[PDB]
Every structure is written in structure tokens, then in C-alpha cells.
Amino acid sequence: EMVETVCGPVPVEQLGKTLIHEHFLFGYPGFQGDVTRGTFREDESLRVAVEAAEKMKRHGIQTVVDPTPNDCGRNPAFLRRVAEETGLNIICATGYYYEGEGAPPYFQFRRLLGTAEDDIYDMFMAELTEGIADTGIKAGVIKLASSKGRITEYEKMFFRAAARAQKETGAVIITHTQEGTMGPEQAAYLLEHGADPKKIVIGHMCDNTDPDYHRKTLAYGVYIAFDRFGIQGMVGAPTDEERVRTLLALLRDGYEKQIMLSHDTVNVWLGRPFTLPEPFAEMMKNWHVEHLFVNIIPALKNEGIRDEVLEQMFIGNPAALFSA
Amino acid sequence: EMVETVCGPVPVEQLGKTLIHEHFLFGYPGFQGDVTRGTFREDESLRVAVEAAEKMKRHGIQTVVDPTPNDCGRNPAFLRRVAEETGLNIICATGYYYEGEGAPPYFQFRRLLGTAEDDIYDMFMAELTEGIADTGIKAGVIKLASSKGRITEYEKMFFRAAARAQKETGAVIITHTQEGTMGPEQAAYLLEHGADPKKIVIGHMCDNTDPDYHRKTLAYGVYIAFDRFGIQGMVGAPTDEERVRTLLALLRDGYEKQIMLSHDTVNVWLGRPFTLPEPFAEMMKNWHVEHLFVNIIPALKNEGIRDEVLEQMFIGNPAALFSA
Ligand SMILES: [Co+2]
Ligand SMILES: [Co+2]
Ligand SMILES: [Co+2]
Ligand SMILES: [Co+2]
């Protein structure tokens, strides 16, 4: 009946309205090497992160799951500062990213030593049950990620280790899927290694616009997340209009007890600042923590989606997910 | 007349006996994610690094070039602690590793933004002429690295930026070659982009046992390094016996003014500790900073190599390399 947050154990019944997937900080692996020109400005970063948290609170959000991977600049102590300042519950993750935006050399080397999968399991257990570094903060979810059209040999080590850790702890698993691929495959592979579908959220499912793909994933009894609302503009990637269309089809089928919504925001980028080209920037303008509440939810309600269904997704589902 | 060390400017004439390629600290990208079980313990690490420095001093070494890449745990302030304690000159690098043991996502993303190559040049210039982070330490070399059988599109950004920075600063370039490939190609590519061959060291040349490959590289007028003595058994390394065989062939051809020797030690590993299996462990037993002096140099002298040739490699060559 408890979940580990960056401020310690909190009753699951008190989580309330939740965003299942947002980042306060995030950096692409390699950002650390660009420290001279891409300094981490902690004060300004905290101010921005706190402002984001306050924007969430204004729409009734009480809890955020921040699944920033261990190799992507995860900073539990920083998250704790945000939570202490705002009263928001923040749940962090233990896990590594997928190969293309991860840092595989370290555990690839340990794989050559023959200990990598066991080391990963040990890491998960340490961070779920003991604490991260010297912070005293425990992770509340395991973050998994796969590549485009493939769960690689490297990635599979983490999947297997995650299943082992989940069996021992009852921990929630949150995943990344790449470019609308591998949803059913992730669910199937985790379940074959004994993971509990009621403790799994298959992420970035909104990237795929074919509802049959979602239904294949939902068939495993897992949660799915439409967690990238506001991200638009890349070549073959979907629009919010497409995301909403897909979501409406699944709600019509009665899948609301398996669906959660988020934005996958990056409120503070680690490394050097950057700007997107003007056409791309305009397309990305809705990518912020208020977008679900100001734009998407009103659109769902315009289509006749009832408040009880919306409450199921934002309140009921996180409560059920984190409950034994 | 001067080179930047971790303790500031030192006259090139005062560098004396030098090891061209050793790591006080090193981690494979991703080590940061295993912080809980693999925390950097600074007091013990400093004790070990200081001991390594004292071992090198006992054999007359006055200077070490530590080319730890920016994405592999480079810590200039730590190197400065070692140097302040021991009086050893330590010269550090600016650069990123090759793809397979690097963290490319960050600069791959900036390549997509259209700024990466200019950003890398900016970083090199900042770190060579201003300082690394808030340390006040300037790098004295640029570290470059290529993959097996090719210099990738990613890697080439760094090669071009390095040639540009060299033209501007006169900085020395130190390279990594992967599995005995791309020696000639690196030299050719750098010179094509205006780099000075008398300021370039093509590294890991000892991995290749065909002296024609070395002669092809040497014809560009660059330095080469047999810089991995002690590494045998693993990663396809030749044996030290094979390294010595190749080296003797080149010294007898009269190439001593273009050759330098080192071990490429990792004195303190970043991340979780590890042990090699007993067969591998035994093969790697000589991989330490005293090996060239206790074992290899005596083997060379047993093969008729004179003190004047040895002094050319360890004293004359580094002095020439770092001189205008
Ligand atoms: Co993701
Ligand atoms: Co994310
Ligand atoms: Co190397
Ligand atoms: Co090295």
C-alpha cells in the first residue's frame, strides 16, 4: 500500500491525479563530455523544474513518474529538491535507455566478463530496495527500453533482469518503445520471464496509429501509455490529431482501465541549449505539461468521453498500477 | 616553448622522460548509471593514482600524457591532485572516444541540429585555450579515435574539428586506432585537412603485427605509438612478444625518431570493480606502469637496442612532438 517517491514512502491511495511519464531533467548520453560549454546551471534548472511542477499542480496533478534513465542524467537528489519545494510526489526509475540513445559500452563490457545480467539485476534490487547512491532515495519503477523493430541482445539483459526484480519486489515496470514498434513483443517477452502484466506499462504507444497494434498489446493485460502528447513534426511521426483518433477507438472498445496519458516533456535539457528550425518549433509548440489539460482533454470531452473515464485514466489506473 | 599541464604551463625542455599514453582514471560510457554499486571513492582512488605516479617516478618518468576522453570519465582536477602530491607532470586531453566505446547520442543529436562540428571545434578551443569546466586546467592534447576499418561520419566531425583547432593553436593530436586499422587513413585524413604531421601521434599501432602497415603510416611523417604493452589475451591483442618483434623491425629500419612507447594502463576503473577469469587474468598480469621498465626495455636491450635509441623514444621524441 506504499510506493517509494524521492521523498520516501507515500501511500498509494494518496497519489491522486498522476502524470505517468515526464522528465524534469534529461540529457542524451555524451552530454557529460560537453561540460565546459554545456554547464548544468542548477539554480535556474531548479526554478524551471519548480515552475513546471506548479503548472501541473494547477491542473490537479499530485504525482509525477519521472522515468529518466540512469545513463541519461537521472538526478534523484535534484528531483527531491523539486518535490520539497512544491509538495508534488515524484517517483523515479532505475534502468538504462535503448541502444540508440543510451550508453551501452559499460554493460556490454560486463557482458564480456559474463556478469552483466546479474549486475543489472543487482543494480535494480539495490535501487528499488536499498537506495540510489548516497541519497537514501529509492526508485519506484524500473525503466526498460527497446530499439526500432528489435529488442537487442543488450536490451534483453535488462528485460530479463527487470522480470527477475519484479518477481522479487512487485516493482512496476515502465517502458519505452521506439518508433511505434515492439509493444506486443515487450509484453510477450516480459510475461514469458514471469513478469506481472498488471505491473507493466508499455510506453510510447501513441506513436503507432493502427489500433490493431494496440489491441495486440492490450491482449496481454498490460497497461499502455499514450505518453507523448504534444510531440509533433518529425517526418513519419504522428500528430496529436492522430493520437486522439487512435485513443478514441480504444476507449470505444472499453479499454480505459488499461490506458494512461502523458507528454514525455523534457523541462530542463542537460548539455548545451538548442533551438529547433521555425517550422519544426511551431509544430512542437504544444509540447508542455499543461497540454493534456488545456487541449487534449477538452477535445476528448468534445467527443463525448465522460469524466469517469478520464478519472479512470489519471487517478484509478495509477492507483491500481502501484497497488499489490 | 610551453605545454599546458594539469598544473599549468611547463617548459617543453623540462618534460624529460615521458609516457605518452596512460590513464589514471577511465570508465566505459555508461559507468555513471552504475553509481550505486560503482561509486567513485576519491580518497582510495587518489591513493592508488599517487602510487602509480610514484612507481613511474622510480623509473625516471617526469611526464605522463593522459588521453582519457571527455566521455570516458576525464577528471582534470583529480589529475591535478595527483600531480600536486607527486610533482609528476600530467598532460590531459580534449576529445571524444570512437563510437563502439563512446557516447555518441549527444553529438549525433547536435549533428541533426546542424551545429555539432562547430560545437566540437568550440569545445576544443575552449579546453585548449581557456579551461576545462571550472578547473582552470587547459588540455595539452586533442584525443581522436576511429572505429574498426572505418572513420565514421560521427568520428570525422571530431577529426575535422581537431585539424581546424590544430591549425589555430599548434596543439598536439593523439589518436586511438581500433584493432590495428586506419593508421594510414587517419594520417591522410588529418593532413588533408591541414594538420601538421609533426604534431600527430597515431596510437595503438602495436595491435598490428605487419610492419608494412606501420611503414605506410610512417611515410606520412607522423609519430606512431606502441602504447599497449602488457595488454595480451583480450580484445584480440597481440602478445608482447609480437609487439617487440614488430618494434625491433622498425627500429632496425631506423624509425626511432617517429616511435613512442606506453602501456595504456587504467589505474583506477570507474564504475563497479571487476576481476578477469584466471586464464585471462594471468595473461594480463604485466599490464601496469612499471612493465616497460622492468620487462620490455630489458628485452629490447637483450636484442641490441642501445640507450641512445631508448632515450630518443622516451625523451627526444616527446620534446620534439611538443615543440613548435
Ligand atoms: Co522514451
Ligand atoms: Co521519456
Ligand atoms: Co584507446
Ligand atoms: Co587509452
CA dist., res. B147 & res. A179, Å (int): 27
- Which residues are bridge partners to A141 per DSSP? A93, A172
CA dist., res. B324 & res. B320, Å (int): 8
Q: Which residues of chain B have a CB within 8 Å of the CB of A235?
A: none
Q: Which residues of chain A have a CB within 8 Å of the CB of B105?
A: 28-30, 100-103
- Which residues are bridge partners to A10 per DSSP? A3
Phi/psi at A203 (nearest 5 deg)?
A: -95, 170
Q: Which three cell numbers stand for residue A42?
A: 542548477
Asked if residue A5 lies in contact with residue A90, where contact means CB atoms within 8 angstroms, the answer is yes
B211-218 and B183-192 helices, crossing angle to 10° = 10
DSSP B295: I
| CA-closest candidate to residue B171, choices B133, B198, B135 | B198
Cα–chain center distance at A117? 22
DSSP A124: H
**How many folded domains does chain B comprise?**
1
A264 and chain B in contact, CB less than 8 A: no
Bridge-based pairing state of the strands B141-145 and B89-94: parallel
Question: Rounded to the nearest whole angstrom, what is the distance from the C-alpha of residue B181 to the centroid of ligand 2?
Answer: 38
Ligand nearest to the CA of A25: 2
3-state secondary structure of A63: strand
Give CA separation, A2 vs A17, A124, A321, A323, in Å.
16, 18, 12, 8
Range A80-117 burial, b when 16+ CB lie within 10 A, else e? bbbbeebebbbbbbbbbbbbbbbbbbbbbbbbeeeebb
CA dist., res. A96 & res. A103, Å (int): 8
Cα dihedral A171, A176, A177, A179 in deg (nearest 10): 170
Q: Where are the alpha helices (DSSP H) in B30-114?
A: 42-58, 76-86, 105-113
Nearest CA in chain B to A40: B133
Query: Of A25, A26, A31, A34, which to mutate for an interface test with B (greatest number of B Cβ within 10 Å)?
Result: A34
Report the phi/psi class of residue B102: left, alpha or beta, with left for phi > 0 and alpha for psi in -120 to 50.
beta
CATH of the domain at B78: 3.20.20.140
Integer-rounded Cα radius of gyration of chain A: 18
> Which of B70, B113, B131 lies at the smallest CB-CB distance from A274?
B113
- Which residues are bridge partners to B223 per DSSP? B201
| CA-closest candidate to residue A38, choices A274, A316, A240 | A274
> Which of A28, A69, A127 lies at the smallest CB-CB distance from B36?
A127
- Which residues are bridge partners to A259 per DSSP? A224
Q: Domain containing A278: what range?
A: 1-324
- What would the DSSP string read from start to end of A16-73? -SEESS-EEEE--TTGGGGTTTS---HHHHHHHHHHHHHHHHTTT--EEEE---TTTT
Please indicate whether, in this complex, the C-beta atoms of B36 and A110 are within 8 angstroms of each other. Answer: no
Q: Which residues of chain B have a CB within 8 Å of the CB of A274?
A: 110, 113, 115
| CA-closest candidate to residue B29, choices A158, A93, A105, A26 | A105
Phi/psi at B266 (nearest 5 deg)?
A: -120, 105
Say which amino acid occupies A13.
E
Q: What angle do CA B263, B267, B273 make, to 5 degrees?
A: 125
